[model samples]
Target: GEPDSLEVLVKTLDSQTRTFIVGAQMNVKEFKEHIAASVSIPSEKQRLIYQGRVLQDDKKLQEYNVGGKVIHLVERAPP
Candidate 1:
């Protein structure tokens, strides 16, 4: 079977909203690249937040439990 496509919404700090459609198997790294291109931001500077928790780069989007709901995108903080 073809991999299912998932819909994830991203909200920026400026209240801008964007929708992304990705394969269920897409990893966080690729997801960031996709979003970075769309929003004109660097992939390394983008941070994904879901349910108030920051998502790491090692997991797939499905693992973060994102679906039709919105995920917050913010600039990565200083380490």
Candidate 2:
């Protein structure tokens, strides 16, 4: 698991768009809380991706990315 002090890097193809950070960990609700508290992530912009899919709704979380199991956050579309 990523430690609390662990660095997290986020970037998009566009150079103008970017955000970098350290420390992000929690369950779905807690994740939202952490993002809300953090400065780097914009409103509702931070996303949780797991098993090659973006978790859009809680149903998806139930279907695939559960329990912190070994999963891939692989990009389905070209980056």
Candidate 3:
């Protein structure tokens, strides 16, 4: 990718919003660790959405063609 980061729109259950800088090649769990600082929701509690599919933690973003796309973040259920 030309840019070092990708722009990802973040939306939570409460409707809180923010833009996250992510990488194209990073796997989902790796992506989670990168955004964890500002996201409040830990990776264990993070679920990413791509189109109608829920993203897999071990998959890379480019596999989902997720660059320049909107991703919804869902909170994980209680342990």
Candidate 4:
């Protein structure tokens, strides 16, 4: 039913961003890991803020209607 993923653009350090084919059922944690792969930031250190709201773990992306949405990423120092 449609691709089991969505297009999400993540803004990372260096004012860079990449369009990611995120899993439709991807949770916050899952999404973080996905970005970490390309952003090179550890998943644990990555924080996703969407529309000024910090995403919570255990919740799926669909819950936030993130399809074709922009999600910004930031690191929590060098943990």
- lDDT (C-alpha, whole model) for all candidates: 0.86, 0.38, 0.77, 0.85
Global CA lDDT of candidate 2, please? 0.38
Q: Please give, for residues 1-79, the per-residue lDDT of candidate 3 as tens digits.
A: 3686667776777777777777657888898777777778888888888787888888887788776767888878734
lDDT of 2 by residue, 19-55 (tens): 3332333344344344444334443555555556665
- Residue 39, model 2: lDDT of 34
lDDT of 4 at 45: 90
TM-score winner between candidates 3 and 4: 4
lDDT of 1 at 36: 90
Backbone clash pairs for candidate 1 read none
lDDT of 4 by residue, 25-50 (tens): 88998888877878989989988899
lDDT of 1 at 78: 40
For candidate 4, the TM-score is 0.87
User: Of models 2 and 4, which has the larger lDDT?
Assistant: 4
**Residue clash pairs of candidate 4:** none
The reply for model 3, stretches above 4 Å from the true place, is: none
Residue-level lDDT for 54 in candidate 2: 65
Weakest 10 consecutive residues of candidate 1 by summed lDDT = 70-79
| TM-score preference between candidates 2 and 4, better one | 4
C-alpha TM-scores of all predictions: 0.88, 0.33, 0.80, 0.87
Stretches of candidate 4 off by over 4 Å are: 77-79
Q: Which candidate gets the maximum TM-score versus the true structure?
A: 1
Error of 3 at 58 (Å): 1.0
